[PDB]
Amino acid sequence: DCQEHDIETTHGVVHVTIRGLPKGNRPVILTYHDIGLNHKSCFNAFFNFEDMQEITQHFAVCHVDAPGQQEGAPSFPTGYQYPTMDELAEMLPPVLTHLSLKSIIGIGVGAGAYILSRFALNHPELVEGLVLINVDPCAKTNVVDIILAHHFGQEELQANLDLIQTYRMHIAQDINQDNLQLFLNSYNGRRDLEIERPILGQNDNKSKTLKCSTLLVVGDNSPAVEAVVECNSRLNPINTTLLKMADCGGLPQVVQPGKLTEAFKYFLQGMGYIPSAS
Amino acid sequence: DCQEHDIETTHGVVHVTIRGLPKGNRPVILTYHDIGLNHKSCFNAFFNFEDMQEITQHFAVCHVDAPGQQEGAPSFPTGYQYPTMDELAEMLPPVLTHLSLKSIIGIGVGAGAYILSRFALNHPELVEGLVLINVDPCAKGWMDTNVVDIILAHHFGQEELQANLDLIQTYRMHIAQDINQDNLQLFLNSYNGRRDLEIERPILGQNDNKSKTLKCSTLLVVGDNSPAVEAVVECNSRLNPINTTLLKMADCGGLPQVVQPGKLTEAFKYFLQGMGYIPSAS
């Protein structure tokens, strides 16, 4: 059923986790986490949710842990040349090639969102759709207090509820505090996606945009509300949908997995997959 | 769902592969494999069987890979002190500890079987039951070309082996390619040098000079055409018939988990049923 691979790229190694088994005329669900998380902390709560298993049975689910961000990853040396956000997306075709994966339905959060997008623009042939959670297509004391600051809204983060401290502990303990610095640094070094909404008559600016179907997701109480909204205005509305989730801030995948599973289903039905929908 | 771990022991690292998540009370099914195999080669065919998924979903399955037997394991150095079978069995307690596992239900093949049994004698509090496939409790007595040819003989009966069926060739290629040929020899060496299990059937009249025997429920499994049959039968004779059962699988030889898995799943169900697990049959 499952298998974990350590795949050799030209930008070093990337640790993946295949769950389920795919068919040759059916795609794979590739996942990519945000800064401070891994495939387990980021997605597994959402992915092991009851409503998802009905979906996931039909499509094999592959979870990509970023370089040094996989659990039990050794510390990267001090002067290691950590792959840049753009380079990370350069490492994604090999992952598909290694596992003879013809195409994916991407699911990414924040940095994972950006990296899946870059990849989708670089290789739109290999990407069929994108769920882009809390995506920011523009550029930007304690590293842990910085990532929780990116993840959750001040009210929510200040309130330090069970979620806040739970994931505060994950970041702290689960993820390499050396490799996490280099992955944060990388994300922080990200350039503008430089995607503009197309015009039917004629384009005022010759800017490429996502050809594949896109579901943008952001909590009302998310700090990424403006950034996901910018992105939407810069994306082809014929292929894009914007979901603003109520009573939700950081990690809407875990905060509201019920609401998000329903949308992913509606989204997937739209492409032609899970037509029966139980 | 699944997770791999490279677990530090005092006898070095041991590779393991956890699928599902277990609670405190219910025990986590533990596998240990034979020489020239790994958890993948040995168990995943059997474990991924239809009828098993019904049982295995309900229990967690920690697949242990032997030192330097896990896929993509680097060659050990020339003079590397490779853990003895007893030392291999001492690596198990730290694994339960590392994964906050309370107890296990062991499944072992060949070396796998012996290692779990040494563990079960060391720590009866940790084992609730054992299924032992093609186990040999007695010392080899063959101290001395190609480990692969050696290993094939070990796993498959001469009559079976003479035919050269798809399984003999399939597993002949697996032993060659799957395993680092440096580390295999050492694991083969380590298994061959094994000592007598020192089990003796008790007598009900009076204590049999404080005889030492397994205290957990046991199911010994062997194919009719297996070369291990009289070793397993000896083992059985040396064990408590009250807490033991011997399963002779008809029209079957080496690797019964791979061959006739439906039958073994059914047997393995009844085994689990005896413990008080799986109240209703699937």
Numbering used by the authors:
A (entry chain A): 29 to 168, 183 to 320
B (entry chain B): 29 to 172, 183 to 320
Structure paper excerpt:
Although NDRG3 has a high structural similarity to the α/β-hydrolase family, the substitution of the residues of the enzymatic catalytic triad and narrow folded cavity due to the presence of helix α7 and helix α10 indicate that NDRG3 is a nonenzymatic α/β-hydrolase fold protein. The NDRG3 ΔNC structure includes two domains: A canonical α/β-hydrolase fold domain and a cap-like domain.
The helix α6 model of NDRG3 is amphipathic where the electrostatic surface appears to be analogous to that of NDRG2. Comparing helical propensities of each residue on helix α6 between NDRG3 and NDRG2, Ile171 and Ser176 of NDRG3 overlap with Met165 and His170 of NDRG2, respectively. Based on the helical wheel model, we designed NDRG3 I171M/S176H and C30S/I171M/S176H mutants, which mimicked the helix α6 sequences of NDRG2, and determined the crystal structure of the I171M/S176H mutant at 3.3 Å resolution. The structure of I171M/S176H mutant did not exhibit a clear electron density map in helix α6 region, likewise to that of NDRG3 ΔNC WT. Taken all together, the unfolded helix α6 region of NDRG3 is structurally unique in comparison to NDRG2 or any other α/β-hydrolase fold proteins, and the structure is not only determined by nearby sequences but seems to be influenced by its surrounding environment.
